[PDB]
Paper text:
Poly(ADP-ribosyl) polymerases (PARPs) are a subgroup of four enzymes (PARP1, PARP2, PARP5a, and PARP5b; PARP5a and PARP5b are also known as tankyrase1 [TNKS1] and tankyrase2 [TNKS2], respectively) that continue the reaction (PARylation) to generate long chains of linear and branched poly-ADP-ribose (PAR) on target proteins. PARP1 is involved in repairing single-stranded DNA breaks making its inhibition an attractive strategy in oncology especially in those cancers that have defects in additional repair pathways. Thus, TNKS activity promotes Wnt/β-catenin pathway, and TNKSs are potential drug targets for the treatment of cancers driven by Wnt/β-catenin pathway, most notably colorectal cancers. We determined crystal structures of the catalytic domain of PARP1 and the ART domain of TNKS1 in the absence and the presence of the ligands.
Niraparib selectivity can be explained based on its conformational energetics as well as the electrostatic effect, whereas veliparib's overtly basic nature might be responsible for its selectivity for PARP1.
Author numbering: 662 to 722, 726 to 745, 748 to 780, 786 to 1010
Amino acid sequence: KSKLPKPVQDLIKMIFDVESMKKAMVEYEIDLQKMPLGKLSKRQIQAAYSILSEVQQAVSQDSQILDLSNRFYTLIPHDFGKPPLLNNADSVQAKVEMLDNLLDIEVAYSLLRGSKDPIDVNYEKLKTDIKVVDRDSEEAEIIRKYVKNTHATTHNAYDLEVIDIFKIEREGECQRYKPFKQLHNRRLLWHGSRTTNFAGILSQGLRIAPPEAPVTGYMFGKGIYFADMVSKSANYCHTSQGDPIGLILLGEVALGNMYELKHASHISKLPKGKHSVKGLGKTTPDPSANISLDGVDVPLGTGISSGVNDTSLLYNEYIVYDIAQVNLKYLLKLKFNFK
Ligand SMILES: NC(=O)c1cccc2cn(-c3ccc([C@@H]4CCCNC4)cc3)nc12
């Protein structure tokens, strides 16, 4: 019998939910006999990204493309009960999205399958210390206020309800973050992801897309993205009426000198002296309402006009291009109340 608090036990069950992993594979139309969870590999996913990149290169420049489309389905077997040809941009992005999720699903399954309560054994595999933040604490009030105040006006499909607040420490992240611990402009920001990705995120941290993956769909190039508006990140949990509970991170991000951009720029190397990109939004949390939570700026102010009209973005976003610039601090379990 596990001594872990019930919210921690319930979080471990959510994270290693095989049913959720299989349902996702069914939704992606993956053939679960030819490609069961146990047969997914890192080398297979790496090669599939390369094929999707090759697919775009061939399309940009019909027999040549069909061979690439067929090599993709041979590597990742699907069950269509005819296979849709990988020619249009939406078809390629749908497959990249599938791989991005399969990558962490592979991590979750490999951990799980690789005398004690199963919940305890699987908790230890995450190599992450997880503690419940009390509802009556100063931290919980600051965090609830951050959720409350930064829900965007255009994101009106749902209301957000905080279920549990966890304080997290990934093993080895302290050591990895040490070169950036004293960098200026450290901010507490949101990062949403599908619930099926959290086993991978807790065990391996937030990661950058591999070079093999297509460059399309990355407004500021391959990096780790964050928002200062909870709903902007909460949209990336991909919660539905079917699964209305999502997970969202609060990470301390060492932004340093921000390369401030109003439009897309596929960053390969930042300008010298710049440590991050700030995508400028039209609406920003009121800077006069910034609070410090144990030395880190928490931009929990209600949204006001940023005074920037000539931008592609409604809300800010922040990108770092080195995995070491992130130190995960909190993990929230959120209820999405769909309207
Ligand atoms: N995940 C977040 O909380 C987040 C916050 C703010 C801006 C963000 C932008 N992203 C983002 C998420 C996904 C992607 C691509 C989309 C197409 C498939 N490959 C990944 C590019 C950017 N994630 C963000």
